[PDB]
Symmetry: D2
Subunit: 334 residues, 4 copies
C-alpha cells in the first residue's frame, strides 16, 4: 500500500482522511497538527456539515485507532522535523495552508517523504493539477505538486469545454462561496490584514479575491490571461457556485448547444444536472464540478453574444475527491 | 400635508412609514394589512435588522398612535373596500405584493385615492421610476406608477453612466441578494411553485430570476434588451450587491476612468465608496445604490475588453428611501 | 403490506416517507398536499438538512415513482374528499398541522381510512403516545391516536426515569429548539397572532410556549401537572436540546446515580452519551431522545437539592423515527 | 479630563471607545492592539451588529483622528512596554482577554498608568464590580479592578432582588448566549482545547461553562455558592438571555409579586419590560440587564415552589455601558 502522511488535520486534511478510507491501496499512517490526540480524534468522528464518521475511532498514545488501524499523530509546527523517513512516507498531503510554495514544501522531502501534494495553489517551479483536466501532465518524476484550489477545480472542466468547442475570447468569473476557516467569527483584526476577511463571516456578503482567476492559466495554458474575477463569501458553511460570463469565438451559439457540449464532457470529475438544486444539495458530493444547465444564459444583441454558465462545487468534498484522485495517480507513477 | 395610506404594512410598508417620519410634508393617516392592531404596532416598534423605532408607539382602537399622531388601521383584503374617499387619501403606497398590475391597483382609485405608487415592478400601461434616473418622466397626470424593484434601483444609475460615457453594447448581471419574505423558513411547497424559493432560505445559496434584468429597459429605454441576468439569494436578512459584466463601445477603457465616471455622477440616490465594506455596512442606508470602486475590473485581451462593476444596496432601506423620494415628487406635481 | 397514506407532505410527512423505505412491511401508496407533482418529487429528492434521497425519484401523472414503486398524489385541502376508501388505506399519517383534533381527524375515517395517526399533540378523547414510554397503552381498537410532539418524545423517557427512581416533586423545563416552518423568514404578521413567531427566525432567540409542558401529563399520568416550561427558538434549522430542572423526593442524589439510571434505561428510543456533542451531531438520528451525561448537574444547599439534566433530539428525524415505530405497532394490532 | 487608554481594540474595546464619546469627562488618548492603523480605523467606522460610527474617522500616523481628536495607537503585545507614563494615562481599560489576573494586569501600572479596569472576571486579590449592584464597594484606593462578565451583569440585579425580597435558597442558571470571538468559524482545533468552542459557531447549539455561575458570589457575597449553571452558545452574533430557576425562602410567591419586585428595583443598569421582544431588540441597549416579565413562571406543587425568571442583555453593549459607568465612578474617586 501507498504510505500517506497528512500535514494539517484541518477541514481538507480530515476529509482527505475520510475519503482515503473509501479508496483501496492508499493508507494514512500519520497525521501532524498543533493539538492533542483527543481533539484530532473528536474532530474526525464529528463533522458539522459533513456528518458523523461511520467507523470506530479510539484514542491511543501513538495517536488514534480507526476501525482497528493505528494512526501515529504528531504535534510539530516545523515540517522538516517530522519522522517521515522512519515511517517510510511515500506522499505527504500538505494541508496546513503554511507551505504553499515549492521551496517551503521541500521541508517534507528533507524529513524523508518521497513526494508532496499541496492542497492549494502554490508558488514556484511546479505543476498545478486539476484531475481529469490535466493530470496527464504528470510523468511521475515530480517531487512537489499543487492540487490547485476549490474554485479552479470547479472551473477548469467548464472552461476547457468552452475553449475547445467555441473558442474562448475572454471571460469574467464570480464565485459565490461558502465561508472558510480563514475568516473571522466576529469583526476583528485579520492576520493577513484583509479588511474584508476580518468581518463576521456568517453575517455578511464579503467580496474577496480568488486564486482560480489565474491558477486557471497554469492548468489550461492556451487560455492563460483570458480569465479573471473574484469571490463573494456568503453565510453557508459549505457548498459554492462558480458563475462564468464569456465572449466566444463562435457567435450564433445556443443555450442548447452549450449544455449538450457540457453533458458530452461529463465524467467522475465533472457532473451534469438539469435539476433546480441549491447549495446544500452539493454538500458531500465527489464531482469536482457540477454543471447546472438550468443556469445557462445566452445574450444576443444583433451580431454579438455574451454567454453565461454556472457550476456547483462542495469546496470541501469536491476539492478533496479531486485531490485524492490526483494523489492516487501521482502514486501509481512511482 | 399630503395624505398617504399604506396598503400592506410589511417590510417595505413599515419602513416607508418610518422613512416618512423623517420627511416633512408627508403624513401617513392610515394602514391596511391582514392582522390586529397589537401586531402592527409591535412590528413597527421592533425591527430585527433595521432596529428599534425611536418614537413612542401606542395601540388605540382606531389603530395606533405614533408620537401623538393617530393612525387608522384596517383589516381588509380587498382594496376597493377601503375607506380612502372618506379619509381624503392623496396617494396609496401599494406594498402587499398582490396588486402589481395597473388594472388591479386601479381598485384603490375606485376606493377614493387620487394616486397609487406600487412598490415593485408592475405589468400594464404605466411608467416605472427609479428616482434620480428617470423621475423627470413624471408630468403629474399619472394615476398609477411603479417604483421599480430594489435591484433596478441599484443598477439604473450604474448602467446610465456606462451607456452615456462608454456606449453599452451588452451585459450580464448577477445580483447577490438577501433572502426575502417570499422564501420559506424550511424546505416546503411554494405558493408560486418555484422549486428554489421553496428551500430553506437561511441555509442555502438559491439561484433565482430577477425583475431588474428587464424592468431596466423601461427605465433607460436606449439600453432596452441589452441586459439580462439573475439572482443568487444568500443567508443575510438584508443588504445586497449587484455585479455587472459588460461589453462597451469604447475600448482602451481603464479601471480609473470607470471609477471617476461613477464618482462624477454621485448624488443622494447614487453613492460612491472606496472603502472595503461588506453587506451589513449598507444596512439602513438611504442611497438607492452604492458604487464600490474596489470591485471594478477590466479584462483586456488584445483588442477586446470586458468590464466588471458592482454596487451595494439595502434592498429594504435603499429601495424605501427611493420610493419615498418618488412619492414626494409625485405628490408635488 | 400495510397501506399508508400521508396527509401533508411537509417536513414530517417527507421524512416519514423516507423512514418508511427503511422499514419492512409498511408501504406508502398515496400522499396529499397543496401543490403539483414536480414540487413533491423535488422536495423528496432534495433536503437541506437531511440530505439527498438515496433512491431514484421520477414524476409521473398519478404522482411519482420511487425506486420503481408508484405513489399516487393528491391536491385536496378537505380530508373527507380523499379517495382513501378506493385505495384501501390502512393508516393515514396526519401531518398537515390542521387536523390536530380527534373530531377533525375523523374526516380521514369517513374518507375510508382505517386509522389516523396525528403527528402532533391533539385535543379530544384520544391516547397520546411516545414510543417505548407508553405505546403499550394501545390495544388496537383505537381509531385516532396522537404521536405527541418532538419535545414530549425527548422528555418523556427522561421524566419517567426520574419519577421511577427518585420520585418527582416538581420541575421546570426549557427547550432550546430549532426554528420550524411556522416561523417567518422576515419580521411579518403571523397567522396565529403570535408576536414572537412573527419575527425573523434565523436572526433571533425567540421565546415561545411548548406543548410538551403538558402533553407530558397525558403520557406519564402520575406526574401530571408536576412539570411546566417553554421554548427558546434559535437559528439552527434542525437539532434541539431539552433542559430539565427538578426537585426530587430522594435527597443525597448524585450526578453518578442520575447518569447510571439513564444509561440503564436506554433503548432504541432513548440513547445515552458522554461525548461532548453539539446540535448538528444529532441531525438525522433515530433515537427519540439522547441523554447527554456531560450536562447533568446537582445543586445541594444544606438539606436541599436541585437536579438538572439535558437530552438532545433532532426535532425532525428523532420525532419521525418515533412516529414510524408507533405507526408500525398500531398497524400490528389492527 | 480623565485620560483613558484601551488595551485591546476588539469588540469590547471598540464599543468602550464609542460609548466614551457619548460620555462627558472621559477621553480616550491611546489604543493598543496587534495590527496596523488602517485596520483599527476601519473596524471602528464599520460594525456588523452595532452599526456605522456616526462621526468622522481618519487615519494619521500617530494612529487615527475621530471628530478632530487625535488618538495615538500602538502595536505592542507586551503591556509593560507601552508608554503609559509619557501620556499620563489615568486608567487602562484592559480588553485583550490576556491580562485577566491582578498580577498580570499590574504590567500597565509599571508602564505608568494609575489604574486598570479589566473587562472580564479576573483571578487574584481584587474587587469585582457590577455597576448599580456593588460599585459602592469602591473606595478609590483600588489599583486593579474587574468589571465582571456580561452574564454576571445580566444576573446580579435579578438575584439581588430575589434574595432581598424572598430569600434565595438555591438556583440554577442557563444563559442562551450569542457566539463570540473565541469560537471558531469552521470545526477546527481550539487554542484552549475546548472541544465545543472548537465547533462551527454559527451552525450549532454549543453547551459551555460560564464565569457568572460563581463570579456572582464575589458581587453578592451573601448568596455565594447558592447559584450554578452554564451557557448554550447559539447562532446570533450578539444579544443574549439569562434564565434563572430558583427555590426561595418564601413560598406562596406569585408571578405578579416577582414582577413588581423587579420593576420597583429598575434603574439605568436594570431595565424592565412586558413587551414580547426577541434578541435583536436588545442589540445596542445600555441597560446592563433587562428583566422580561413575560417569561416569569411559578411552579406550585402542594407546599413547594419553583420560580423561573429571565433577563435580556446585549453581551456587547450592555456590558460595555456597565463597564464605562464603573470607569467613570472609579475615576471620580481617585
Ligand atoms: N473550502 C476549503 O476549506 C478549501 C478548499 C480547497 C483547498 N483549501 C486549502 O486547504 C488548506 C487548509 O484549509 P482548511 O480549510 O483545512 O484550514 P483549517 O484551518 O481547517 O486546517 C488547517 C490545519 O492546520 C493546522 N496547522 C496550522 N499550522 C500547522 C503547522 N505548522 N503544522 C501542523 N498543523 C498546522 C491547524 O491546526 C488546522 O487543523 C488551505 O490552504 C486552503 O487554502 C481549502
Ligand atoms: N427586499 C424587499 O422586501 C423588496 C424590495 C423592493 C420591493 N419589494 C416588493 O414589495 C412588495 C412587498 O414586499 P415585502 O417584502 O414588504 O412583503 P411583506 O410580506 O413583508 O409584506 C406584505 C404585507 O402585506 C400584508 N398583505 C398581504 N396580502 C394582503 C392583501 N391582500 N390585503 C391586505 N394586506 C395584505 C401582509 O400581511 C404583509 O404585512 C412585493 O411586491 C415585493 O416584490 C420587496
Ligand atoms: N420540529 C418539527 O418540524 C416537528 C416535529 C414534531 C411534530 N411536528 C408537527 O407535525 C406537523 C407538520 O409539521 P411540519 O414541520 O412538517 O410542517 P410543514 O409546514 O413543513 O408541512 C405542513 C404541510 O402540510 C401541508 N398542508 C397544510 N394544510 C393542508 C391541508 N389542509 N391538506 C393537505 N395538506 C396540507 C402543507 O402544504 C405543508 O406541506 C405540525 O403539526 C408540526 O407541529 C413538527
Ligand atoms: N460578548 C463579548 O465579546 C464580551 C463581553 C464582556 C467581556 N468580554 C471580555 O472582554 C475581553 C475581550 O473580548 P472581545 O470579545 O472583545 O475580544 P476581541 O477578540 O474582539 O478583542 C481582543 C483584541 O485584543 C487584541 N490583542 C490580543 N492580544 C493583545 C495584546 N497582547 N496587546 C494588544 N492587543 C492584543 C486582539 O488583536 C483583539 O483585537 C475578553 O476577556 C472577553 O472575555 C467579552
Amino acid at each position: 500500500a501507498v504510505k500517506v502522511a497528512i500535514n494539517g488535520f484541518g477541514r481538507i486534511g480530515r476529509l482527505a482522511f475520510r475519503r482515503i478510507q473509501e479508496v483501496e491501496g492508499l493508507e494514512v499512517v500519520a497525521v501532524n497538527d498543533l493539538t492533542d490526540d483527543d481533539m484530532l480524534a473528536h474532530l474526525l468522528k464529528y463533522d458539522t456539515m459533513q456528518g458523523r464518521f461511520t467507523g470506530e475511532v479510539e484514542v491511543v498514545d501513538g495517536g488514534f485507532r480507526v476501525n482497528g488501524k493505528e494512526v501515529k499523530s504528531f504535534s510539530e509546527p516545523d515540517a522538516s522535523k517530522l519522522p517521515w523517513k522512519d515511517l517510510n512516507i511515500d506522499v505527504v498531503l500538505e494541508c496546513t495552508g503554511f507551505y504553499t510554495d515549492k521551496d517551503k514544501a521541500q521541508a517534507h522531502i528533507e524529513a524523508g517523504a518521497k513526494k508532496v501534494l499541496i492542497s492549494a495553489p502554490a508558488t514556484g517551479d511546479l505543476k498545478t493539477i486539476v484531475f481529469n483536466t490535466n493530470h496527464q501532465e504528470l510523468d511521475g518524476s515530480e517531487t512537489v505538486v499543487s492540487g490547485a484550489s476549490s474554485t479552479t477545480n470547479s472551473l477548469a472542466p467548464v472552461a476547457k469545454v468552452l475553449n475547445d468547442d467555441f473558442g474562448l475570447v475572454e471571460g469574467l468569473m464570480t464565485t459565490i462561496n461558502a465561508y472558510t476557516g480563514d475568516q473571522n467569527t466576529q469583526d476583528a483584526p485579520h492576520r493577513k490584514g484583509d479588511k474584508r476577511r476580518a468581518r463576521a463571516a456568517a453575517e455578511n456578503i464579503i467580496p474577496n479575491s480568488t486564486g482560480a482567476a489565474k491558477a486557471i492559466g497554469k492548468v489550461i495554458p492556451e487560455i492563460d490571461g483570458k480569465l479573471d474575477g473574484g469571490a463573494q463569501r456568503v453565510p453557508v458553511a459549505t457548498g459554492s457556485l462558480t458563475e462564468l460570463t464569456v465572449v466566444l469565438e463562435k457567435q450564433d451559439v445556443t443555450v442548447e448547444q452549450v449544455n449538450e457540449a457540457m453533458k458530452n464532457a461529463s465524467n467522475e470529475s465533472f457532473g451534469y444536472t438539469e435539476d433546480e438544486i441549491v447549495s446544500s444539495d452539493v454538500v458531500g458530493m465527489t464531482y469536482g464540478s457540477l454543471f447546472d444547465a438550468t443556469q445557462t444564459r445566452v445574450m444576443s444583441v444583433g451580431d454579438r453574444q455574451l454567454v453565461k454558465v454556472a457550476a456547483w462545487y462542495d469546496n470541501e468534498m469536491s476539492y478533496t475527491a479531486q485531490l485524492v484522485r490526483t494523489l492516487a495517480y501521482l502514486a501509481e507513477l512511482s
